[PDB]
Amino acid sequence: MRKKLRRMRVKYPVTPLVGIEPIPRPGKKHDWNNHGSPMAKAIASEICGLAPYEKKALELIKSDQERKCRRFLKKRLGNLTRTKRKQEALTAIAREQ
């Protein structure tokens, strides 16, 4: 009776820890939301420009084909989450131009 025991499940009442702050673990220190040097990413994007599939995805975005750009970038990258974020990184390029 798996669903019934899961539904009738009662958590043990326990007290959460409200006060303490985490000690930074040595060797495990990252700010994952601001990872790289953002000036270094801007410089290399200025030098190197865009990849050929990124140029093709701008041409889909600029020609009002963001549906086809989504299919194209999903086929290129292979992951939907990076596909969504690549497209909004590329519409920001197409909007500033």
Q: Answer whether 73's CB lies under 8 Å from 87's CB.
A: yes
d(CA 7, CA 28): 38
Interacting residues toward another protein by CB under 8 A: 1-2, 4-5, 8-18, 20-23, 25-26, 28, 36-37, 40-41, 43-45, 47-49, 51-52
Pick one of 11, 21, 22, 96: the residue that binds RNA (CB under 7 A): 11
Q: Minimum distance from CB of 97 to another protein (Å)?
A: 19
**Residues 6 or more apart from 90 whose CB is under 8 A from it?**
54, 57, 58, 61, 69
Q: Minimum distance from CB of 75 to another protein (Å)?
A: 16
